[PDB]
Amino acid sequence: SGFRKMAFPSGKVEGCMVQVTCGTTTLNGLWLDDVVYCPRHVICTSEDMLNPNYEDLLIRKSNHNFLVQAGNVQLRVIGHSMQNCVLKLKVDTANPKTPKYKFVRIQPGQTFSVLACYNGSPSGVYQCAMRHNFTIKGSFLNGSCGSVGFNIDYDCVSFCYMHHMELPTGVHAGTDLEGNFYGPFVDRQTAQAAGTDTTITVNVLAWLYAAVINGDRWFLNRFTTTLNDFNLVAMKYNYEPLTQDHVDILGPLSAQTGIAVLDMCASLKELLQNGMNGRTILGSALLEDEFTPFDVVRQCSGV
Amino acid sequence: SGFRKMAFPSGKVEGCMVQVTCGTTTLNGLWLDDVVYCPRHVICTSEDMLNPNYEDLLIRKSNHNFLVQAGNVQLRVIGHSMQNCVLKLKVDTANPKTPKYKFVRIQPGQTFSVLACYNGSPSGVYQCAMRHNFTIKGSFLNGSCGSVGFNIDYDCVSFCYMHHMELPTGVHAGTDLEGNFYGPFVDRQTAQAAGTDTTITVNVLAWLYAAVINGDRWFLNRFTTTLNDFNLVAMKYNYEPLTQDHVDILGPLSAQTGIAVLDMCASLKELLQNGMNGRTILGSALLEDEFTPFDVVRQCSGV
Ligand SMILES: *[C@@](O)(C(=O)NCc1nccs1)[C@@H](Cc1ccccc1)NC(=O)[C@@H](COC)NC(=O)[C@@H]1CCCC(F)(F)C1
Numbered sequence A, B: 001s002g003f004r005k006m007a008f009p010s011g012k013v014e015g016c017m018v019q020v021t022c023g024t025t026t027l028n029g030l031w032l033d034d035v036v037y038c039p040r041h042v043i044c045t046s047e048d049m050l051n052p053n054y055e056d057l058l059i060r061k062s063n064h065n066f067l068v069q070a071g072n073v074q075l076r077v078i079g080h081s082m083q084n085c086v087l088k089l090k091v092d093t094a095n096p097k098t099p100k101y102k103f104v105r106i107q108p109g110q111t112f113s114v115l116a117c118y119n120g121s122p123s124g125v126y127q128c129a130m131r132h133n134f135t136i137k138g139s140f141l142n143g144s145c146g147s148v149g150f151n152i153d154y155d156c157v158s159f160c161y162m163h164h165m166e167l168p169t170g171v172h173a174g175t176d177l178e179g180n181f182y183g184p185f186v187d188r189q190t191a192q193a194a195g196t197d198t199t200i201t202v203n204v205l206a207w208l209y210a211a212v213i214n215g216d217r218w219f220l221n222r223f224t225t226t227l228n229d230f231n232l233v234a235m236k237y238n239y240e241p242l243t244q245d246h247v248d249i250l251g252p253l254s255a256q257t258g259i260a261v262l263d264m265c266a267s268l269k270e271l272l273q274n275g276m277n278g279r280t281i282l283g284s285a286l287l288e289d290e291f292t293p294f295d296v297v298r299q300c301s302g303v
């Protein structure tokens, strides 16, 4: 028993982190085979951040402008190119610790682990979710750019995120590993801000199933609603619409607990309308939306 | 910015996990140099758990009774002995991935990372705190015994916990790495239960400092109280007494924010008396007591 925000073991990713320096800018890189991936703004200076032309800035650079450090061993840069908002630095040595990997792009509502790094050295690991406005609620300080987000499935690391910057509200923005931003954000200095956000409904129901599996049942009731009558109330509380596909994904949790998806929706409908009355669910006094149905099944007992 | 429950990178610990089998019992072990450490109840059977004599059970065992698996390679057991509630299995091979390490015992209020494992394979990492009643609020399923808790300081792994069992309320109990239980718990079948718990006051104040550093200031006030008048109210809400030593530990956070420790105590005193009025602090609607002053300094900006 127990239910916690659990990150994947970060071992496989720690062996890939390096420090990339260009001039006075130092940030983190990801070393896979003979390529180091890092945010392209490592070539920029404080003056070059109003409206930079990265193609112009990259062509005025040479291989010797990039210092790459893998722990203590220096890596010799033999090539450089840009791929969208990411730099690809060809190095002379293939990383002997390169795990089996994929570059995948995630959707709002999906979760991933983040290995926060500073100067090529990992400081901590935690779990994150991609919000509907394409921001994440992470924990990052100056020098954390280049830190990556990932999921693991049978020793295969699926890299999904690279950290680039912090938005004015304190939320975080980054790209997939192909250099394409999550959301309408740019790697230049603008007054950009995160758009409106909604609560991930399928995740809140999955977390209510984890609570039932762990003994929290005070919020249950005999009632049941229709998918359409549930969506009318969800809309008023700024919750994402629940679809029939989400009901089918919640199926295994519904089967394990003997509580129907529309039965669970009637309890969520009441929690939104009345609140919790000073009671808690899995040690929390708010409804949690950062656990997917997969995360719940992965952590909870199958009994 | 941002503030999250952040575990240490688990890489150094993942390379030490092994699977230990004795008969039909399979659990996790920790391989350091040529010794594998695991819970001693791996030698027991369902019949032997009423009131076992572990000395009697261990003497009826031989080296060939223990199968040790490090990933795929089988480790040959050349010695065995008991150290309190832990078994020490001497193996023929020294772990080449053994990091620099210490066996340290932690106090209530301290935190540590947990690498949950099943069959010698790590499944996830998360942060935990030792409560005043010597239990932890972890996330563990059948087969998780042998999972370890640790802290890292400049590449030195200080192992502080080994998981043994779950208590009836769903909380977890284990030993230090010398085999000595945290708390009045035993590794036999009894109706044992966790004692009363208190809230860790110095941790709640440290977390209020993280909120001020991260922009949450609605709970601040102009008032100030004495250490003695604060402790009278803390006692009523089941909070641990705050000492002058705790005030001196909170000093660096007080200096960074310009808010005096007794000033912060007046805000906590008001939060306990009136609640939050539907407002949140660092995304939480309850007062968090699982971040130490160290954890806050480690994660928050020094500015
Ligand atoms: C790096 O880009 C970084 O850490 N970004 C993410 C952050 N998350 C919380 C705070 S920052 C880092 C690179 C660097 C620049 C110069 C010297 C050394 C490292 N940048 C910053 O730390 C930061 C200010 O430091 C000078 N600047 C930015 O993050 C840029 C702001 C505009 C958008 C951007 F171009 F994407 C990054």
Ligand SMILES: *[C@@](O)(C(=O)NCc1nccs1)[C@@H](Cc1ccccc1)NC(=O)[C@@H](COC)NC(=O)[C@@H]1CCCC(F)(F)C1
Pocket: A001, B024, B025, B026, B027, B039, B041, B049, B140, B141, B142, B143, B144, B145, B163, B164, B165, B166, B186, B187, B188, B189
């Ligand atoms: C192992 O001891 C274990 O996983 N313990 C911690 C748990 N946390 C949540 C659920 S269990 C595991 C060892 C094992 C025994 C037999 C077969 C395979 C593995 N034990 C258990 O999973 C569990 C029931 O499984 C048969 N029994 C216990 O945990 C014991 C209960 C009494 C106290 C104890 F002796 F310390 C352990």
